[PDB]
Amino acid sequence: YQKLIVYLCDFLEKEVQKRGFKKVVYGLSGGLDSAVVGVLCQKVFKENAHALLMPSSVSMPENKTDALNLCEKFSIPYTEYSIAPYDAIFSSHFKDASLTRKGNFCARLRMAFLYDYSLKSDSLVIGTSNKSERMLGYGTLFGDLACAINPIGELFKTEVYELARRLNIPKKILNKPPSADLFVGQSDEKDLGYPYSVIDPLLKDIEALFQTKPIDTETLAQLGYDEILVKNITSRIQKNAFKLELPAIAK
Amino acid sequence: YQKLIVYLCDFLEKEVQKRGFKKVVYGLSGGLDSAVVGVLCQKVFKENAHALLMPSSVSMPENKTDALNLCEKFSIPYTEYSIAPYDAIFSSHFKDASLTRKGNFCARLRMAFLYDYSLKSDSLVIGTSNKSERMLGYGTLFGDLACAINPIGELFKTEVYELARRLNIPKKILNKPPSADLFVGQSDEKDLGYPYSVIDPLLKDIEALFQTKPIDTETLAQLGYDEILVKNITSRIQKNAFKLELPAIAK
């Protein structure tokens, strides 16, 4: 992984630079993903790298603290701006709004402020969505997936968590159970039903056999994979493959 | 243009369908672009096509009326939801916020509600940004350019306005001077400096000669184009080519 870090950094210095920038900003929810990116950007831009903590009306005050500790540890400048009063309005107008609805809206708010922040400070937005998340379709389009550059999007959640270790990320971030945070008691291993030590291995084979041809559940069980786990994931994938594709435009 | 319409419709029935939908929604600011798309979608989905009018704290009550007339004319179901109370908050927190900053934020709000609306009604978002706008980079990323499908993105503003005529769009929409609407007294022919009868012709040659190779101002003046007008546009283009490209992700 030491060689990996060196790679991501260089990828960062080259991408931001070829666009005419010297500063970058990203959301810092206080999670593994968001923390990993931040440390990398700090390694390359130091003070020119800025983090934005946008807790909502339902965020966990504990996560904000972890993000506050993280910053303090790597000397990462930051700005605290709560989106609470915005989701408040959303609620008054939408009382029957489902969990996911409120979650999508808040993630689109955090996106508006990262880009509003980049406009007035001349910075580029850097995403923090990992490969496993992108493949699974578990991300908000034009929300937390909206960025100009992403250094760890081709890294599975497993490769992500381990990279962080070599990055010396506060252990409180590591031991922290996967959770995109959108409301209360949410977690990835809860709405997905399985841990990343179960999900990831199959994604490695899916992105090795069915490069461009349709996925075949049959040829998957042969490698050694639970039936339901193979049919569930496969669906999820094909059901969200549109999120990582440009919009459809008539030629 | 009659043959063109037939094309766009079919493009619409096929795209929405291959994604697992039968309903579509789009923003209806009461402008040429937004109106053109709406009429097309109505031709194909009838009542299954929905328009969303999201006026802000600075919108012109006259435009909302034109959108209200438009709908009434083609029997287009719609929902009226003002984003005012949201930009209000943005303002209180940001009093030194520039025009463009407030404009970008509001366009990202309209995007949040189109996608929140599509989530609860099972619909697909359809963009309304025209080719000239995309090339010029005059559009909000993850704002009014955020859509799943766009039927007129490969149509220059000139080809757009004329298509509308054959669509029998209320003349009040036609005669209406170009303006993306972001605040007061704004207009395209004001922040760009030239009319589309000046901008478009050059774009047709730019997207005919320099397919993949860098633009050359010299070989452009030879065709017959003002120097400043050639150097200005060219810049604009290369300065926003990142908006219509997927985010940068390290392999």
Swiss-Prot record, chains A, B:
Keyword Ligase in annotation: yes
Pathway(s) annotated for this protein in UniProt: Cofactor biosynthesis; NAD(+) biosynthesis; NAD(+) from deamido-NAD(+) (ammonia route): step 1/1
Known EC number: 6.3.1.5
Taxon lineage: Bacteria, Pseudomonadati, Campylobacterota, Epsilonproteobacteria, Campylobacterales
Protein name, as recorded: NH(3)-dependent NAD(+) synthetase
Species this chain originates from: Helicobacter pylori (strain ATCC 700392 / 26695) (Campylobacter pylori)
Family according to the record: Belongs to the NAD synthetase family.
Keyword tags: ATP-binding, Ligase, Magnesium, Metal-binding, NAD, Nucleotide-binding
Reported function: Catalyzes the ATP-dependent amidation of deamido-NAD to form NAD. Uses ammonia as a nitrogen source.
Molecular function as annotated in GO: ATP binding; glutaminase activity; metal ion binding; NAD+ synthase (glutamine-hydrolyzing) activity; NAD+ synthase activity
Coiled-coil features, chain-numbered ranges: none
Taxonomic superkingdom: Bacteria
Gene Ontology cellular component annotations, sorted alphabetically: cytoplasm
